[PDB]
Design an enzyme around this catalytic site. Structure first.
Site, mmCIF file in Angstrom:
data_model
loop_
_atom_site.group_PDB
_atom_site.id
_atom_site.type_symbol
_atom_site.label_atom_id
_atom_site.label_comp_id
_atom_site.label_asym_id
_atom_site.label_seq_id
_atom_site.Cartn_x
_atom_site.Cartn_y
_atom_site.Cartn_z
ATOM 1 N N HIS A 148 0.784 -1.753 -0.222
ATOM 2 C CA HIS A 148 0.007 0.057 -0.169
ATOM 3 C C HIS A 148 0.753 1.373 0.394
ATOM 4 O O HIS A 148 0.910 2.129 -1.125
ATOM 5 C CB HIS A 148 -1.102 -0.311 0.768
ATOM 6 N N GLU A 149 2.140 1.213 0.601
ATOM 7 C CA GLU A 149 2.821 2.598 0.667
ATOM 8 C C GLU A 149 4.075 2.343 -0.848
ATOM 9 O O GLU A 149 3.853 4.352 -0.811
ATOM 10 C CB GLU A 149 3.208 2.159 2.253
ATOM 11 N N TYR A 207 -3.502 14.411 -1.930
ATOM 12 C CA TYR A 207 -3.404 14.216 -0.915
ATOM 13 C C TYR A 207 -4.954 14.900 0.210
ATOM 14 O O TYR A 207 -4.551 15.516 1.077
ATOM 15 C CB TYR A 207 -2.093 13.485 0.016
ATOM 16 N N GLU A 232 -5.957 7.084 -1.678
ATOM 17 C CA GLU A 232 -5.342 6.161 -1.164
ATOM 18 C C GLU A 232 -6.469 4.497 -1.513
ATOM 19 O O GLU A 232 -5.779 3.798 -1.072
ATOM 20 C CB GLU A 232 -6.824 5.912 0.379
ATOM 21 N N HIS A 275 -9.117 8.724 4.003
ATOM 22 C CA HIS A 275 -8.889 7.281 4.302
ATOM 23 C C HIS A 275 -10.204 6.777 4.649
ATOM 24 O O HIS A 275 -10.608 5.795 5.344
ATOM 25 C CB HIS A 275 -7.977 6.512 6.215
ATOM 26 N N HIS A 285 2.192 4.634 -3.017
ATOM 27 C CA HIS A 285 1.746 5.793 -2.970
ATOM 28 C C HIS A 285 3.086 6.902 -4.191
ATOM 29 O O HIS A 285 2.686 7.287 -4.495
ATOM 30 C CB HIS A 285 1.856 6.627 -1.928
ATOM 31 N N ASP A 321 -8.874 14.299 8.926
ATOM 32 C CA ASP A 321 -8.510 13.172 7.886
ATOM 33 C C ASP A 321 -8.399 14.207 6.915
ATOM 34 O O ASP A 321 -8.487 12.828 5.229
ATOM 35 C CB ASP A 321 -8.805 12.406 8.227
#
Ligand SMILES: [Ca+2]
Ligand SMILES: [Ca+2]
Ligand SMILES: [Ca+2]
Ligand SMILES: [Ca+2]
Ligand SMILES: [Zn+2]
Length: 316
Positions: free
Chosen positions: A142-143, A157, A166, A231, A146, A226
Site C-alpha cells: 500500500h505504501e 492528498y 488511498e 481514509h 503511493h 483526515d
C-alpha cells in the site's frame, strides 16, 4: 555500499523464516543489488531522523527480535518490485529503476507507516494496537504504491482525489498480497493490527461498513478531519473495486465479477494514462470505463462490469 552480492537468512515479524538479498563488505548489509538500482534498508534506532544507518550485520543471519522488522521491510519491498515488473512491466516506482529505501524502528511506539515522498518509514507499533508494521505485505505494498501514484497521476492528498489515492494503494496492496499468496484476503492490515484480537483489520474492501466506512456515495464524509476523509471515503472506491473483481449485488445493483487480474490491468492503465492530480470520483469512473474500453472493447462484459460497479456505489 560497494561489495559482493550474497544471500542471508532471517525471521520476520510473524516468526517465519525467509532468505534475503544482502551485500558483503566487512559487514553484511541489507542492500539488494538484484532489483533495479537497489533496495536498501536502514535502522532509525528509535529516532525520527531519516534515513538512519544502512543496516549492517556481522554474520548474515537475522534472527534477533530487533532484526525482524528490517527482514520484512527488505523482503516485502522486493516482492512489491517483482509484482510491478512482472505483472505491469514497470521498473520501480519511477519506471526507471529508482532505488527503494526503507527505514525501520522509527520513533518509539509509533503506530503507523508511510511513504514520505522519498522513502518508506515504518514504526514498531505500541505492541497493543499494532506490531511492527512492515510485517504486513498489504501495508508495505500500500505504501510503495503511493510512490507509483506520485510519479504518475500525482493525485493530491485531500478530498476526493486523496480518497482515490488511498483506494489505489489499498487495491494494489491487496493484489500484491494475492500475488505472493500470503494467506490472501480483501481486508487491510490484518497481520499486524491488534495482536490480541483475532479476525479484525484496519479496513475492509469487501464490506467497508464493518468498520464504519462508507460503501455508497450518498454516505460519504464531508467534513475536514483526515484531510477531508481520505481514509474514510476510500471505502466507496474499494467496494467498487471488490465488486468489479468478485461480483455481487449491492444496494440492489448486480455486478458480474471479472477477476483480479483484469481489475489490476484496468486500474493500472487508469492510473498511468488517464488520472490527473485533481481527479474526482466521477473522473475515476470515466477513466476506468475508458481503460476497460481500450483493453477489452466498448461492448465487452468487462466494460459492463465496471459501469455496474460504479452504479452500485452511486458514482456517476
Ligand atoms: Ca546477525
Ligand atoms: Ca491476509
Ligand atoms: Ca490483507
Ligand atoms: Ca487483530
Ligand atoms: Zn495510504
Amino acid at each position: 555500499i560497494t561489495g559482493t552480492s550474497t544471500v542471508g537468512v532471517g525471521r520476520g515479524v510473524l516468526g517465519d523464516q525467509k532468505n534475503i538479498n544482502t551485500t558483503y563488505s566487512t559487514y553484511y548489509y541489507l542492500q539488494d543489488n538484484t532489483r533495479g538500482d537497489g533496495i536498501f534498508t536502514y535502522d532509525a534506532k528509535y529516532r525520527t531522523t531519516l534515513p538512519g544507518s544502512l543496516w549492517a550485520d556481522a554474520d548474515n543471519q537475522f534472527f534477533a527480535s530487533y532484526d525482524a522488522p528490517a527482514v520484512d521491510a527488505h523482503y516485502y519491498a522486493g516482492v512489491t518490485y517483482d509484482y510491478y515488473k512482472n505483472v505491469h512491466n514497470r521498473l520501480s516506482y519511477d519506471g526507471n529503476n529508482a532505488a527503494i529505501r526503507s527505514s525501520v524502528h522509527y520513533s518509539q511506539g509509533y503506530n503507523n507507516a508511510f511513504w514520505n515522498g522519498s522513502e518508506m518509514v515504518y514504526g514498531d507499533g505500541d505492541g497493543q494496537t499494532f506490531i511492527p508494521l512492515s510485517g504486513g505485505i498489504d501495508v508495505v505494498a500500500h505504501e510503495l504504491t503511493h510512490a507509483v501514484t506520485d510519479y504518475t497521476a500525482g493525485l493530491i492528498y485531500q478530498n476526493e482525489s486523496g480518497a482515490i489515492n488511498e483506494a489505489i494503494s489499498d487495491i494494489f496492496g491487496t493484489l500484491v498480497e494475492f500475488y505472493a499468496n500470503k494467506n490472501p484476503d480483501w481486508e487491510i492490515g490484518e497481520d499486524v493490527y491488534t495482536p490480541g484480537i483475532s479476525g479484525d483489520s484496519l479496513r475492509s474492501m469487501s464490506d467497508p461498513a464493518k468498520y464504519g466506512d462508507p460503501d455508497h456515495y450518498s454516505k460519504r464524509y464531508t467534513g475536514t478531519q483526515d484531510n477531508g476523509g481520505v481514509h474514510i471515503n476510500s471505502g466507496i472506491i474499494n467496494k467498487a473495486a471488490y465488486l468489479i473483481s468478485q461480483g455481487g449485488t449491492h444496494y440492489g445493483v448486480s455486478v458480474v465479477g471479472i477477476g483480479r487480474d483484469k481489475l489490476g490491468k484496468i486500474f493500472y492503465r487508469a492510473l498511468t494514462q488517464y488520472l490527473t492530480p485533481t481527479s474526482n470520483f466521477s473522473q475515476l469512473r470515466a477513466a476506468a470505463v475508458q481503460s476497460a474500453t481500450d483493453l477489452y472493447g466498448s461492448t465487452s462484459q468487462e466494460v459492463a462490469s465496471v459501469k455496474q460497479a460504479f452504479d452500485a456505489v452511486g458514482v456517476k
